[PDB]
Symmetry: D2
Subunit: 220 residues, 4 copies
């Protein structure tokens, strides 16, 4: 089928609202799907500077960029050239809850992402509205089928100032646009996301991700 | 002294997206604030007929309509003519999660509502996407202060066909537009919402609510 | 269906063995109550593990829905479960990760109810309100009774008043099972609750507890 | 200091008493393991309460993080807590309302670990996969180790494979506490797990269990 090439470009646009603050962010970058790496340049067009921690938006900024071994079905590379979409909920330990959504399409060598983001109930004295986050810690996503839908469960932790951690529970559902794409079996996906550079107000940010899929012990 | 009249008008516009489906609803009704009763005529302008259960929207369709006794601070009537807003998350037991927000203003004898609704991860064979809901059961909302913000917790239940119940946990935060409104103490608010009439596609709906505030046992 | 054999004045006899954060304890109870009026009181005494290193309030809910005023139009599943009795299982999930499970087997002989309660909790933080003894009281609450998987279930989201006008959340769920065949299952209804500690010494080795509970159908009926 | 308290080949002795949905049981365990390789095997025998009316798989993770392969750049909190030992508390939250708590007090003598385990569960529905015995195994999982309130905490989110390629969801959290003060707490890290039943009779009165655990720092390359 080909469709996916070793070097592909990414184009992204996000419109969102968190605790009543509207914002718009643009994204531009490239990535290596078969090696599971990608980078993007992010710029805030509306709502800058953001009154909350930028780290709660980073994982909404494509599982096509993941190294898949031969013994595990790649549900996301086979959903193309037509594409797919996903829906995610983010439940934080202090009551903050977010909801994300992304429609992914491809034409030529460029991926086009249309993202929506919405969060509510972050406390004013909490680390999110006070911008006390440092980074996401490494995480392992669980892939399994539920009600004929590929579902991803993952419990992440933000690192805070003072060597504290901030719990978040995530659940994502993936739906291919065309009928007939084979669903995979149970497997794990390792994740690593990191901000490389940013200005003082995070109007411009450079993001990076590395992701690899595996079967777990003892097959690592 | 009010501000609020014994008979007020209600004007409401809602935009939303549930499981990827976009929709637009308009509302027009009246209500008696000091008796805690209101009614509204709803009409689906875009996205009709709705492919999901209409019931999951009715609690997003104002605590000004609630009977408050004298010994309990009435945070919501003290918020006008300036107004207030609220944010809410709905966590259904089978993984469906909704977030909601509404900005309430006042002009003359009319309340103006701007509502946003977003939900994700509803199972395709669940009671919501299968339209197996009948009504909301009577419920009691808890009102207390959390991080300097008035908060309402309530564990509701939807009656399904066959007399089964579908649980949902709700969490709402209320923010007055002007600083200086005295926050209340712990109390409770009884709720009762009911659809009076509808077409068979739920494109036109007539909604009704009755709510009463009290202190709980052993007297009120 | 049949007769309750419940008198207007009943006695209560209770024994609880438990373990919270690794601390073992045994507490005995003795009291009286009026079932048809939904009121009951008990004198508690710690026999082992005193003085308790945790807040006493987390136990008071474990210390019988027979003591609840039921109207005529709602099925009274608990007074119909006698003279044979019933039992319940409960889980208490607190907002800072503390989780408790409880269990009680209730029988009746003569005019006295007998209770055998077990209580276990783990993962309460060392600096949390429970291990620091910063609780004040439970706030009034309303319990949801409904049938779930053929078993009568009770749902409550309670709140503990803390020092400084803070509140401590707790999510509770109880399943009720009658020991006799043929007890009718009720429909959806609510039960208002009120519990408070009347008196106590300063180490909570001796406590006097009180409760009032009334069932209704919610708005706009009752 | 001289020799380490941990040997390359160590034996395991275990005793568990518990109660699930009102059913009491007692199980004994005997096994061996290689702590530095992160592997252990055990032979289990039900002494009381056989046969168990629930799925055996819900007990297997209660049957010692000493058996884990720890690299040099990650602090090994569990091997440093001996010869005195440590304890842990755990809560298991299943997606259909079943809730479990567990304890274990671990000591050491010679080449043998001693385990004293308690287990309690409530509110498993009669039509659920645990009471119907429709579970097959635990899937491979990854445990998150981090500090919370000065206590090492392990957050793990597991999944049981069911008959018919369905999965049963479970949330678990463990707190670890060493009996000696002064053990250096580790930073954030991950622990890969693999648990599996090797053999069993028809009623699961005799079970052979095996686990493999490895600690690492997560991506990249770790």
């Amino acid at each position: 089928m080909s469709a996916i090439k070793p070097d592909m470009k990414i184009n992204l646009r996000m419109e969102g609202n968190v605790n009543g603050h509207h914002f718009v962010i643009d994204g531009d970058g490239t990535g290596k799907p078969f090696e599971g790496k990608q980078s993007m340049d992010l710029e805030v067009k509306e709502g800058g500077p953001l009154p909350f921690a930028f780290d709660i938006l980073t994982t909404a900024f494509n599982r096509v960029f993941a190294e898949y071994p031969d013994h595990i079905q790649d549900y996301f590379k086979q959903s193309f050239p037509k594409g797919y979409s996903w829906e995610r909920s983010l439940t934080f330990e202090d009551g903050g809850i977010c909801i994300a959504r992304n429609d992914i399409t491809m034409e030529g060598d460029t991926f086009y992402n249309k993202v929506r983001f919405h969060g509510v109930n972050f406390p004013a004295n909490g680390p999110v509205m006070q911008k006390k986050t440092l980074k996401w810690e490494p995480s392992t996503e669980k892939m399994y089928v539920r009600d004929g839908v590929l579902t991803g469960d993952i419990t992440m932790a933000l690192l805070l100032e003072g060597n504290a951690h901030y719990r978040c529970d995530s659940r994502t559902t993936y739906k291919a646009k065309e009928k007939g794409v084979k669903l995979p079996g149970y497997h794990l996906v390792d994740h690593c996301i990191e901000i490389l550079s940013h200005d003082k107000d995070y109007n411009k940010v450079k993001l990076y991700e590395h992701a690899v899929a595996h079967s777990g012990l003892p097959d690592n």
